[PDB]
Design an enzyme around this catalytic site. Structure first.
Site, short mmCIF file in Angstrom:
data_model
loop_
_atom_site.label_atom_id
_atom_site.label_comp_id
_atom_site.label_asym_id
_atom_site.label_seq_id
_atom_site.Cartn_x
_atom_site.Cartn_y
_atom_site.Cartn_z
CG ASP B 490 -1.98 -0.92 1.20
OD1 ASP B 490 -2.56 -1.15 0.10
OD2 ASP B 490 -2.27 -1.46 2.28
CB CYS B 491 3.70 2.10 1.89
SG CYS B 491 2.60 2.17 3.36
#
Lengths: 822, 822
Positions: B490-491
């Site tokens: 997600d990052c």
């Protein structure tokens, strides 16, 4: 029962016990950095945005309430106590808290050690300062250790309380035990990424130790009242890595009998330009230059003392525009000090953060921005002009308004939208108030866009036109304005029809169209449409003004017929055109808002207070019989005992609370003013005392909240808790009550062409003097008052009698002495 | 250090002290009513929706942590204590908490009085039940009063914590001291309006008194540990009107030496059809029929015992599909009990509420929904089938997926939207896994809409086609998939370019277009692309399948060239085509996700574990040298020490936490699976023990969180807190590790045509037996294991040797014995 007293000389409220019925707060900060501070040192601080730039953490609905703040644990030979009483709650031999204007002091003493702390936000600084004085009041030597304590927030308070999946791993600090004038701790969460700011927590002496990790300072399984480090008697010197950063220093303090020591703590906010973020080439160490500069301006008690005196001068000079002197020291304190202070705070804080508002929401109502202006325009007219332009620039080209304004961004909230059909007219209200106070008709020529669209600019006056015309073109079947989502009453939602929990009553409209009408807007149109007409005529638009008086006339007819129930004004017609606010019904027979505002607009007023056949007098008499109580006038009566799906939020409250039978201190003033309009001064002043803080101080155990500021709502007669207040400080009640007592009871109010002097306060205030500064001159108004209903003031200006109630504006610099007899 | 021990026979974790490194929780409820319960009785309960139907209030980040729950204050001649230790923290002679499957017990003893509380949510009931046994263990007579306590939430937990300006005025209750089987309190806030539900809190005996107002029970200025009413020794019989409703009864309990007494408390959730809301024609009294019925089903100890025994049967029957018996009783307990429990709880709870997730957000990742499936499909295949259809029905026609799925509404989140280009392929993963387990190829023919549009239905299989084709038509300059907003990570946001705090890294794209590519999606495409080709071929679409195998081939080549850095796979190419995850850089040299996934897909795999020139072995050797630690494998190395604006959220975390150098237990299984694939069993089993709760139990003081379930992330080697876990319980780590141990280490995995038996676990588990129920038969798998790298199992089926590692499925009812040697 009281929990303290006013100190008028010191302009403070003096709280004499920790054991108040509720946490009582003050606000610090007058520019961009604000603190909430309870009489137990609870609260938090933030820079501009209480949502996205909170320095410190605060828990709403804590058990017990308000058990986090700026603490100072004293360890005296192993006994640990805090001068704020909470959180440790040790028995103190003495306690006092004093809330003053932009500062407070809290003093605690135990076992021969006194600690006084002065808390204030200095002018020109983004920082909260604490001057602590420690005094050995015993006959033996004392060796103490003092542990300061503040819990940081990770800037965005919403994320702080919800996104722990990320944020328990981002907490970071730097520690500086050998700082240029003492010791300091830097909170720099997310400085490594997109934040150009950090917080500094410092003391102006060498700290013997420090702690930056809550869990280490406080200890597992402990509350703040049982913090382990202080009980141990020395700092653990902890360095945070994630979890919960704090700022704490230990300072060693030895004292002979009668000796004292002063210390200065600073909690500061610091921003660096992007290219000055880092001290080091590797970008791991924050640039502390600005932090060291701040700390150098507060390195001594002497510097700190001067900042305090500049603070005091700010407020003394600020509140020097309207004052009164009389036999009534309760009246005087409210008028001279506490009501004006409260109105300034509402300006500064909007509706952001109190002990009831949690600081996550950053908007306020369009209608609140204009109304709040009525109360502060006499103190800060240049800020007011700016505000007016700011909010008018968000207005839509069809004249509709954003219901919610965001002061920080000077934009309207797009999610909420428009549709609350009372919003547009409040802009006339604000603008006219500004012009009467200042005489600055030039604001009307100022170029202002619609919906902030570049290229769309027209003069402000034209926005006034669009507001007026919006009402004219949005009327229902009886000629009364269509209500839309709601009018002033956010809970009167006649187009909502909601049966699903969670749906917002204000923005949901499950059925469309309809013919719902409001009599409040009708009264508002009569009042403020007459003001627009006046501005138009003065502006030289003869025709425009005359057509406007025409629609206004039509609207007063509509109110006295289709808007009239027999003995009072209807409240509305609903979606299907059935009336609301009629004695035909078992519940919701009479509603206060239209009674007050319509009479304020002069609708139904006859020949004098004894003309009982005048609709205005019938209505006010019905308000007296059915709505008045020992604690104020309730909103409607009887309250609804079952859900009225056709009416939205109003009947969802239990009878006697908020909009279902609550006392809204914000709308009582409309009836107080109406009473002065028909000539019943005594009744008007009666009503004013029932809701006003200085007069309710003697029943503090009933009010529960602060005895020095207005609250939004006092529980109504149908509530078990009748008389208990909620939603203190941040409320339009302040503004409207200041307007009422300064302009209609005391009767001194600016006009376009002069100062009107028209007291109507009744027999309880036989003699009084108002000192008003207006258009650059001072007016000394001395009044001798018989208090007789219907008796109006006769004026003598500088020794010679004059006709009417208007005193023409004198050249700036002059002093005009006006004698009034009634 | 440990803070308890497993009781395998009882299928419980036994916590022998209140002083854990952190609050350790269990989940109650298996259908629609759920409770969080700590070992100190903290937590809360809700019906379906933890944001919008929470019965009871819980404070995250309380000081201290977890200090509100279901309490029973014991007053023994004036001494007040709680068996849960907290909140009173009185010294106990004995303490124990046992967390079992869907139930827990907590026992406390002080001065001759023992209290044992069994907590559970019964099957078929929306209620939390507490069976309390009180025992006089002294040689003297006892006369006690017990005060129950629970704090209600106002249903919408978001509002509850924010909208105090309304909600401190709406709390309502009714009290029924003479209830048919005891005494009951009803929390009915907002039942007068739109809510058709209320809560009941009851005890199965006549209460001496009651309290429903928190501030009365607890007292001003007091914490729960200091509650006034219990210390006074008699209830106040408070009736709430606003503020904070609670549920409390006092019960008198006298006991001779050795004597005991049993009590049953119920906290229940009740809904009435709108027609049946009211007991009275005036609509003021809730209709209590349904609550009286619930209370009648728990009026005795005996009823309670049957319900408890039906729960046990529930879990015993459900965890009967996969089991192992070995020398290794840590292994056994994870496989047999805890990993499978954890996996069901993620199905039940999604990502809603834990002691790290606050229960306000109600979605989960589309990718999480499919992955979680992999772990529970063998337990609840009928619910699995349903879930696949529900999530597929939200997918867009072009094959893209909603990144966030809302299980409560069976819809995608429209605000977050799409654009995470790894999302669509996880649907193939879920669907294949389901079909391998059950053999239900018919699910592929089910009609399934796109974006839940009526009329849009096509067979599920065609959704798989659109997912596949989505990657094919969204590749970058090197043939690898465009990453979009991010991939599994997600990052890793290569199209963000954020410099403004508060903007979401996942949805903000300050630059459009670019060429950012992901090797992770490349691997995912080789793995699940081949799974799709297989389904296509079996379905008779030979051309379709062969075409899919072609694109898959291209992708394998692209990973081995443009995706290959030399000794390991790259991670990505950024927006401008520059590589990420190359040795050419000083930070972020190697990243774990591609290494595991690509090898899992067979990319680069050679002739054996000795073929050290095969790219899979080089990559895995790199992983071992640069990423592996005593606590697991970190995400990447070295971690970033400054903000990489071109990379999004990844480098905002301090070194060693979460996605910047943290140990993601979710991705370790990928490398563990890849080690079994290339033939290094000992190494794979090594890695598995490093991150697995039963093996980390002996360092519970370092791990901090629950010794019986996986957590999302263990601090990495570059963190001062290396070894400490965050975000326990609700994580895909459970499913992926269950897959790893059950299907690749122990080696038993379903295929379309039979069950594969291919153990690869190393020398540490020399012999073991797996019992697996599959397609209606029981496979009894006995293994003798040398643990040699490269040695694969040879099988004898019902006495007869066979070739290969596939056992063809037997008819249901039969029992198959398979002996394996390697």
């Amino acid at each position: 029962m009281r929990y303290g007293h006013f100190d008028d000389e010191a302009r403070e409220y003096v709280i004499t016990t920790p054991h108040t019925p509720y946490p009582w707060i003050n606000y610090l900060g007058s520019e961009q950095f604000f603190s909430l501070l309870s009489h137990q040192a609870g609260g938090y601080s933030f820079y501009r945005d209480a949502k996205m730039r909170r320095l410190t953490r605060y828990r709403y609905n804590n058990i017990p309430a308000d058990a986090g703040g700026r603490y100072l644990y004293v360890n005296d030979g192993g006994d640990v106590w805090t001068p704020s009483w909470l959180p440790v709650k040790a028995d103190l031999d003495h306690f006092e808290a004093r809330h003053g204007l932009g500062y407070s002091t809290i003093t605690g003493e135990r076992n021969g050690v006194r600690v006084e702390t002065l808390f204030f936000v200095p002018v020109g600084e983004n920082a909260e300062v604490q001057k602590v004085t420690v005094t050995n009041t015993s006959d033996s030597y004392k060796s103490l250790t003092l542990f300061s304590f503040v819990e940081f927030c990770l800037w965005n308070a919403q994320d702080d309380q919800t996104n722990y999946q990320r944020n328990l791993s981002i907490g970071e600090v730097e520690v500086e035990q050998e700082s240029p004038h003492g010791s300091a701790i830097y909170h720099r969460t997310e400085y490594r990424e997109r934040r150009d700011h950090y917080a500094v927590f410092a003391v102006n002496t060498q700290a013997e130790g420090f702690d930056t990790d809550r869990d280490t300072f406080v200890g597992a399984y402990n509350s703040l009242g049982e913090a382990a480090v202080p009980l141990k008697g020395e700092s653990a010197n902890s360095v945070a890595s994630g979890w919960y950063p704090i700022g704490s220093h230990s300072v060693a303090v030895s004292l002979a009998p009668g000796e004292s020591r002063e210390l200065v703590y600073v909690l500061g906010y610091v921003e660096n330009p992007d290219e000055e973020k880092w001290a080091d080439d590797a970008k791991q160490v924050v640039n502390k230059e600005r932090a060291h500069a701040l700390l150098s301006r507060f390195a001594t008690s002497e510097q700190t003392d001067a900042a305090f005196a500049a603070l005091k001068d700010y407020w003394t000079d600020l509140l020097s525009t309207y004052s009164v002197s009389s036999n009534d020291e309760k009246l005087d304190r409210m008028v001279n000090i506490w009501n004006q202070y409260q109105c300034m705070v509402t300006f500064n804080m909007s509706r952001s953060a109190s002990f009831f508002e949690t600081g996550i929401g950053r908007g306020m109502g369009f209608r609140d921005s204009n109304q709040d202006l009525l109360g502060f325009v006499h103190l800060i007219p240049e800020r007011a002009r700016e505000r007016i332009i700011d909010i008018a620039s968000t207005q839509f080209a069809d004249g509709s308004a954003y219901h919610q304004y965001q002061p920080l961004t000077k934009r309207g909230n797009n999610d909420i939208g428009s549709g609350f059909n009372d919003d547009p007219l409040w802009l006339i209200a604000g603008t006219a108030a500004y012009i009467k106070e200042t005489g600055d008709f030039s604001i009307l020529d100022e170029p202002v866009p619609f919906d902030n669209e570049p290229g769309s600019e027209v003069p402000l006056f034209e926005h006034l036109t669009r507001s007026f015309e919006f009402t004219v073109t949005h009327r229902g079947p009886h000629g009364l304005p269509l209500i839309g989502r709601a009018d002033w009453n956010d809970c009167l939602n006649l187009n909502c029809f909601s049966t699903t929990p969670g749906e917002s009553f204000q923005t949901t409209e499950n059925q469309a169209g309809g013919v719902a009408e409001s009599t409040f807007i009708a009264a508002q149109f009569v009042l403020y449409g007459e003001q627009y007409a006046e501005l138009a005529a003065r502006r030289g638009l003869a025709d425009v003004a005359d057509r406007a008086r025409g629609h206004v006339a039509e609207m007063r007819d509509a109110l006295l017929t289709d808007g009239w129930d027999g003995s009072w004004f209807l409240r509305a017609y609903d979606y299907y055109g059935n009336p609301i606010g009629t004695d035909a019904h078992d519940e919701g027979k009479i509603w206060i808002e239209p009674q007050g505002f319509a009479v304020m607009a002069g609708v139904g007023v006859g020949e004098g207070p004894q003309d009982t056949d005048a609709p205005a007098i019938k209505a006010l008499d019905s308000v007296n019989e059915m709505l008045a109580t020992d604690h104020g006038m309730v909103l409607q009566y009887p309250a609804y005992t079952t859900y009225q799906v056709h009416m939205g939020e109003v009947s969802t409250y239990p009878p006697g609370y908020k909009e279902n039978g609550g006392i809204f201190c914000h709308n009582n003033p409309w009836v107080i003013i109406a009473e002065t309009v028909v000539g019943r001064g005594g009744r008007a002043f009666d009503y004013y005392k029932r809701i006003t803080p200085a007069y309710r101080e003697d029943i503090s155990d009933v009010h529960r909240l602060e005895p020095y500021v207005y609250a939004q709502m006092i529980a109504g007669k149908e509530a078990v808790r009748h008389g208990e207040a909620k939603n203190s400080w941040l409320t339009g009640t302040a503004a409207w009550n200041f307007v009422t007592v300064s302009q209609y009871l005391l009767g001194v109010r600016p006009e376009y062409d002069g100062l009107v002097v028209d007291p109507q306060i009744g027999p309880d205030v036989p003699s009084f003097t108002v000192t008003r500064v207006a258009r650059g001159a001072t007016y000394e108004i001395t009044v001798t008052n018989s208090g007789t209903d219907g008796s109006r003031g006769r004026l003598v200006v500088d020794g010679t009698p004059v006709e009417g109630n208007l005193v023409p504006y004198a050249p700036a610099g002059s002093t005009v002495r006006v004698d009034v007899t009634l």
